[PDB]
């Protein structure tokens, strides 16, 4: 009900106060939307095969799908280059760069060949999104 909307506004204000920002930004709203949604929560998510977390896996999938869908209105190497450009604010060492390269290559291959969300079209194949992912 409207009470939850007021709680959402309060959560956005709390996120804004946390970052010492004089104005509220939509990033706070996106952050609070998950926490409002989750409800029942497990102790810990299981690892995904070197192991990576389920939340991080979903985050990477969402980012890559959003970028591909935005570009619709690409190439494997070009998309990897974009991702490395975007994640530049976090990597601080060469070892982290090679680890990120390993992770992104594995994730792209896994999405292509197991989850079928990405479709290969014929060394730098074109990648397209399965038209039934929202």
């Amino acid at each position: 009900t409207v009470r939850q909307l007021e709680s959402m506004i309060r959560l956005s204000e709390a996120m804004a106060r946390m970052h010492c920002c004089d104005e509220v930004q939509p990033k706070h709203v996106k952050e609070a939307f998950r926490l409002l949604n989750k409800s029942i929560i497990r102790v810990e998510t299981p690892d995904v095969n070197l192991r990576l977390g389920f939340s991080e896996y979903c985050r990477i999938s969402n980012l890559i799908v959003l970028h591909l869908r935005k570009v619709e209105e690409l190439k494997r190497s070009e998309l990897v280059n974009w991702y490395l450009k975007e994640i530049e604010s976090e990597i601080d060492s060469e070892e982290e760069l090679i680890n990120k390269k390993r992770i992104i290559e594995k994730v792209i291959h896994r999405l292509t060949h197991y989850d079928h969300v990405l479709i290969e079209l014929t060394e730098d194949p074109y990648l397209v999104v399965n038209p039934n992912y929202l």
Binding site: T1, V2, R3, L5, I9
Partner: protein
């Protein structure tokens, strides 16, 4: 009345001659709350109040309207009660849990110093000539409910305790809030069944308004837009359905005071045959499923005439009172019969 400025009087008169005064008055109540025309209409109509009468000094006819508000949670009933608390010149707010029978009424006490029997007035006594608000009336203990009927019906309390017999005036407008049992109103049951109150208590009430919660995407859009706009407007740093501009709060308060203290309508142009036929139909359709309903409608028409500052009642007041009363009555019936009731009474609802 003496404190009223002649500028206030001239502004009130200029507002009275407006043909759309009723629309702006109804739209001026609860700007922060969206929709729900019927509830604010009924509360305003009760606030203006009728004319109490004492025919022959044998029986006294009350000029007060009792409103009961049952609604699904999430409809801001407490917000309406708080706004009424603020607006009223004389207002007392009580909660269901914290209101005892001794607290609400006058009680006899021995003075701690001089030790004679003394009377301390209750909330209702201090609500005389004002308005009394009851929150969570469904929480009332039945024993506490027993003392309520006397003040509801006669607007006076007779205290016979410790050898002291006294009578005190209880002319107050009572607004009670309640929640349905189980937290949700069932449309497949009668209004009496959904509320844990006895039939006489409901009978003492004059206007009944039930509010439900429906999942309508367009209504959700309207609610969200209005709420976010209100949130933006009322930030301390930054510090309609009828399409009419709401009146200022002070002007509305002054208008209410002047209308309460000047107008005394006369019912010299009422057609008794139409109301007699309507009441016969009401009996026919109620036995298929009283006089005080007619009295409530009469004082309702008197209040509506007082809204327009008219010394005599025009039949349009009667038509609007009939319309709102019929809307209130059909809302208290089961779903299987309200369609037939609307079809039968489509003449007056149109």
């Amino acid at each position: 009345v003496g404190e009223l400025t002649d500028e206030d009087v001239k502004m009130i008169t200029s507002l009275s001659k407006d043909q759309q005064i009723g629309e702006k008055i109804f739209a001026s109540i609860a700007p922060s709350i969206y929709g729900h025309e019927d509830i604010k209409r009924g509360l305003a109509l009760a606030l203006f109040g009728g004319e109490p009468k004492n025919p022959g000094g044998k029986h006294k006819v009350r000029g007060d309207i009792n409103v009961l508000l049952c609604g699904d949670p999430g409809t801001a009933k407490s917000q309406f009660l708080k706004y009424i608390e603020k607006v009223s010149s004389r207002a007392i707010f009580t909660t269901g849990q914290g209101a005892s029978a001794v607290g609400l009424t006058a009680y006899v006490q021995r003075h701690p110093v001089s030790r004679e029997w003394t009377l301390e007035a209750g909330a209702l006594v201090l609500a005389d000539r004002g308005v009394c608000l009851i929150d969570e009336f469904d929480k009332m203990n039945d024993q506490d409910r027993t003392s309520i009927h006397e003040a509801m019906e006669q607007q006076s309390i007779s205290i016979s305790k410790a050898g002291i017999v006294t009578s005190l005036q209880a002319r107050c407008t009572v607004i009670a809030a309640a929640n349905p049992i189980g937290g949700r109103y069932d449309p497949s049951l009668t209004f009496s069944e959904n509320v844990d109150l006895t039939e006489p208590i409901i009978s003492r009430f004059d206007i009944l308004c039930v509010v439900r919660d429906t999942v309508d995407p367009v209504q959700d859009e309207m609610l969200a837009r209005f709420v976010v706009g209100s949130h933006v407007r009322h930030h301390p740093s930054n510090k309609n359905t009828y399409g009419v501009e709401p009146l200022p709060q002070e002007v509305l308060k002054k208008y209410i005071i002047y209308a309460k203290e000047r107008v005394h309508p006369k019912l010299n142009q009422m057609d008794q045959d139409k109301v007699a036929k309507m009441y016969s139909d009401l009996r026919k359709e109620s036995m298929a499923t009283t006089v005080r309903h007619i009295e409530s409608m009469i004082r309702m028409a008197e209040a509506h005439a007082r809204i327009h500052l008219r010394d005599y009642v025009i039949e349009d007041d009667v038509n609007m009172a009939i319309r709102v009363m019929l809307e209130s009555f059909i809302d208290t019936q089961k779903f299987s019969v309200m369609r037939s009731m609307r079809k039968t009474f489509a003449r007056y609802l149109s």
